[PDB]
Amino acid sequence: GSHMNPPPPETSNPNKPKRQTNQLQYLLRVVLKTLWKHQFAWPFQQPVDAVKLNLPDYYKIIKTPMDMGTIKKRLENNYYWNAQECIQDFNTMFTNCYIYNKPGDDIVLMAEALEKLFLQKINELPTEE
Numbered sequence: 001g002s003h004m005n006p007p008p009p010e011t012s013n014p015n016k017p018k019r020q021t022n023q024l025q026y027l028l029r030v031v032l033k034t035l036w037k038h039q040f041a042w043p044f045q046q047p048v049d050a051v052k053l054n055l056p057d058y059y060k061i062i063k064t065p066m067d068m069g070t071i072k073k074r075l076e077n078n079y080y081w082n083a084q085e086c087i088q089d090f091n092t093m094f095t096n097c098y099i100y101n102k103p104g105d106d107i108v109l110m111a112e113a114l115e116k117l118f119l120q121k122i123n124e125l126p127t128e129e
């Protein structure tokens with residue numbers, strides 16, 4: 001894409017140790033699955049394209065970007081060591097939205113719907129076995 005967008009977050013790095021856990025499996029099969037198909041998922045399914053959206057200040061404000069397209073790749077391509085890393089990525093994505101946008105903007109209401117679902121699912125994150 002544009003040189004004016006940053007490179008996306010890291011999704012493949014052989015030097016980073018990887019592991020499957022039952023909790024990571026749940027994050028892919030239950031959490032990402034649920035949120036990805038939500039009616040309000042589409043703004044969150046790829047990195048913010050600040051050029052196409054005419055938001056030239058986006059990456060001036062948001063220095064820790066994250067999105068569900070990146071999280072999907074990290075889950076599918078076994079990037080994580082533990083569930084906390086992936087939960088933190090979801091939380092970063094929501095917080096970016098809430099920091100950049102005005103409360104009550106459509107995108108914020110969309111993020112909040114996804115976050116409510118997220119919280120319900122993470123409350124049932126299975127005990128690590």
Ligand SMILES: NC(=O)c1ccc(I)cc1
Pocket residue numbers: 042043044048049053107
């Ligand atoms: N700012 C927005 O509402 C928005 C962000 C990403 C996409 I793709 C569409 C809209």
